[PDB]
Design a protein around this nucleic acid. Structure first.
Ligand SMILES: [Mg+2]
Ligand SMILES: [Zn+2]
Lengths: 101, 62, 136, 213
RNA sequence: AAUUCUUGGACCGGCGCAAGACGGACCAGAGCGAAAGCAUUUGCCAAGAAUGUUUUCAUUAAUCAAGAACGAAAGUCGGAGGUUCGAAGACGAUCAGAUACCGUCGUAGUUCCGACCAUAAACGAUGCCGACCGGCGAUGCGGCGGCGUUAUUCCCAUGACCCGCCGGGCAGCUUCCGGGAAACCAAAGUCUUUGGGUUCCGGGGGGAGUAUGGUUGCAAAGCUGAAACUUAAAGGAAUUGA
RNA sequence: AAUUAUUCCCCAUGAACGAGGAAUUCCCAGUAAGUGCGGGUCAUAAGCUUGCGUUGAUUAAGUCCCUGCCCUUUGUACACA
């Protein structure tokens, strides 16, 4: 039976969308179907901050961030717990979950 | 490196695998301002004191 | 093994090309031109267990080792050029990068400017593994 | 069975007069004992120095390529070879809901340095804008790309490399394109993304020795 | 972990050189196309929807057996090319066994030009043309009207925003329009109150898209396509358990 | 009726055992544990069990890490599940 009105993807008026490789696997999935995440981390972690803060020659150097755009297949996205199964009615809510702090 | 005295201001909650730490924000007795979160073993009250072997490394607010 | 720079407060910068893959960690100090190698201590040179060459442990060991080998030759500070596998493969620095970068800054070497040099393609060849990927 | 850092003498590196702080840093070579010579091996090496390290305290997102054209005596005399933005800056600029306009030109200085200049601009979201996207139509993009090319060429072609690098130390070119393309579609993050050196002139000595003060 | 590579200096780092693939991030429930499909720049060539119109012709139209153009991927023949990846195959592991999953190689192929083949879950699993029947907010293109903001500072006037209106398009949200076995659908509605026009096509499950004849193709195979015999269910949506 | 010693007494005999590997049981206050005393069985009759006092702590006011069990969402061609 039909589960999702849009067939689990953001294709409406095309017919073909170039496929993309899952980052975890190397599975070819359509670009619009793939679960995309944008990861912005500092090059050093949290506790190493104060070590490299004071063992650096430059006073007030804002060390850079690494910017990674991750694509997953639905299999990897559910396994790595990026997305999960939802209530039959709660599946519909498209609003991205709250990030405050 | 000097051992520093700090007064536990408040208890937040308990952490560890089997709930065997107390997450508490501990204010330094020497300087009036500096408050850092540390994990505490044993039964801890609110309004007691700790002897820190290092005054810098801080616990993660879980 | 004789730097003519007076050790007043003049910092002699090397450049360490930290290549943290998911099955090895390279800690490699180079001269400022990028040509002449000073010291190269790989991850699997320290530990002889093939599984955990790309560990925070072996990365920390090799980082302390190069830091001692580097202050012998008289390089004071270092510039960081961190990179992942890149190309077709994953673009995240492996689990060794953090222990390597931390440990050789803990070991008395000063950090200049940190940057990323992961070889990213404008667009690449076909990736290893099938169309269905790595089923496991 | 030898100490490979017994026979390695160090050097000083001078940056050209255009930048403030001159002594870049240290170098090493196996000093001559036959056919392969110290100078012969020392020439052709390229350095990538941050503009913050070349000036006193400055832009950390811009880097400059300098090659050892010749060595005088215990001293490498570098010359401008290229320029590029940093990975973190280039990644931080490129974000969703805007058109990213890119243009490249192949231009020649009066002295025989041929350069290839890569410019990049992003369409700017307005102050009272309720719309989320703020894209530019394809003719608007083509016109902005036309203004990018014609400004990047008129700026470089007419004067010598010393004055061109003096323009690249600010971003006087990036400002000029950001001013010209106000009427077509207002931009914000207009930088000369990259510079590549393709063909260089016949290596004279008096040219570089007056570029080095 | 092993097969592989490496003191005839691998892997890592620098400067160049060539090769053949591929156009990241911008990239969207955005656009265009009859569908397949289509993404770096610039130039040339012909095409096209929508809008605008107090232009023109005056029923020239809708759908269609016969016939015809295009048709992903794989595949076949001929020439050029061979970077990556990789049916076959060569091993290395795991396993009770592995002829697989996992790993190192790897021919055909993948790429380009010219001939074929004509099929896909070729999907909106939903023919096309026309009319009528709720509301709301956005969006892409064209037009139209209006405080104000910003650039051309000289701002006439164009561009970037802002607020609304009109027409075509991709979609969305919502409701006792109404329908439906329901899931759900402003179409899958206006259906026992049954009739706007027309093409294709289904008749319990198997046997079987098989046999046979015909036709197309070099081959693979494509299109058309039964019977004997067997069988009381197979199946669709939704519910409560495990 | 005590041989294959029922129970009890006396002299004699003087064993492994120096605190116990893999693992693993029970328990938070008059509780654990030590310590003895009655009931049941009973002609003979406690190393068991079932009750009673006596002396009287260490640690904790927590968690889902391990082991179990119960929910909610979800998928199902299973309903002797
Ligand atoms: Mg399709
Ligand atoms: Zn995957």
């Amino acid at each position: 039976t039909k589960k999702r009105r849009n067939n689990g993807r953001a294709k409406k008026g095309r017919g073909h969308v170039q496929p993309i490789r899952c980052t975890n696997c190397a599975r070819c999935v359509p670009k619009d179907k793939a679960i995309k995440k944008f990861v912005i981390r500092n090059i050093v972690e949290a506790a190493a901050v104060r070590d490299i803060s004071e063992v650096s020659v430059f006073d007030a150097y804002v060390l850079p961030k690494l910017y990674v755009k991750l694509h997953y297949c639905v299999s990897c996205a559910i396994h790595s717990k990026v997305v999960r199964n939802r209530s039959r009615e709660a599946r519909k809510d498209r609003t991205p979950p709250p990030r405050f702090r | 490196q000097p051992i520093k005295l700090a007064r536990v201001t408040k208890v937040l909650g308990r952490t560890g695998s089997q709930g065997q730490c107390t997450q508490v924000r501990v204010e330094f007795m020497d300087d009036t301002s500096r408050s850092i979160i540390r994990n505490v073993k044993g039964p801890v009250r609110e309004g007691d004191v700790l002897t820190l072997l290092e005054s810098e490394r801080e616990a993660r607010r879980l | 093994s004789l730097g003519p720079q007076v050790a007043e407060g003049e910092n002699v910068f090397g450049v360490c090309h930290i290549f943290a893959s998911f099955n090895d960690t390279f800690v490699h100090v180079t001269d400022l031109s990028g040509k002449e190698t000073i010291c190269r201590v790989t991850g699997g040179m320290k530990v002889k267990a093939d599984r955990d060459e790309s560990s925070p442990y072996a990365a920390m060991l090799a980082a302390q080792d190069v830091a001692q080998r580097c202050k012998e030759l008289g390089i004071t500070a270092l510039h960081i050029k961190l990179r992942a596998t890149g190309g077709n493969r994953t673009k995240t620095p492996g689990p060794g990068a953090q222990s390597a970068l931390r440990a050789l800054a803990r070991s008395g070497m000063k950090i200049g400017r940190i940057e990323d040099v992961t070889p990213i393609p404008s667009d690449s060849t076909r990736r290893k593994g099938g169309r269905r990927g790595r089923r496991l | 069975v030898v100490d490979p850092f017994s026979k390695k003498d160090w050097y000083d590196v001078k940056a050209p007069a255009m930048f403030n702080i001159r002594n870049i840093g240290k170098t090493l070579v196996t000093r001559t004992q036959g056919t392969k010579i110290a100078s012969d091996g020392l020439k052709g090496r390229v350095f990538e120095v941050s503009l913050a390290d070349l000036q006193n305290d400055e832009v950390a997102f811009r880097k400059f390529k300098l090659i050892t054209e010749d060595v005088q005596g215990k001293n490498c005399l570098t010359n401008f070879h290229g320029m590029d933005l940093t990975r973190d800056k280039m990644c931080s600029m490129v974000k969703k809901w805007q058109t990213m306009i890119e243009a490249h030109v192949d231009v020649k200085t009066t002295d025989g340095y041929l350069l290839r200049l890569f410019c990049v601009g992003f369409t700017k979201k307005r102050n009272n804008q309720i719309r989320k996207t703020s894209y530019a139509q394809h003719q608007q993009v083509r016109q902005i790309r036309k203004k990018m090319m014609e400004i990047m060429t008129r700026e470089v072609q007419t004067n010598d490399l010393k004055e061109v690098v003096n323009k690249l130390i600010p971003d006087s070119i990036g400002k000029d394109i950001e001013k010209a393309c106000q009427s077509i579609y207002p931009l914000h993050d207009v930088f000369v993304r990259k510079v590549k050196m393709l063909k260089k002139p016949k290596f004279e000595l008096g040219k570089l020795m007056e570029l080095h003060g």
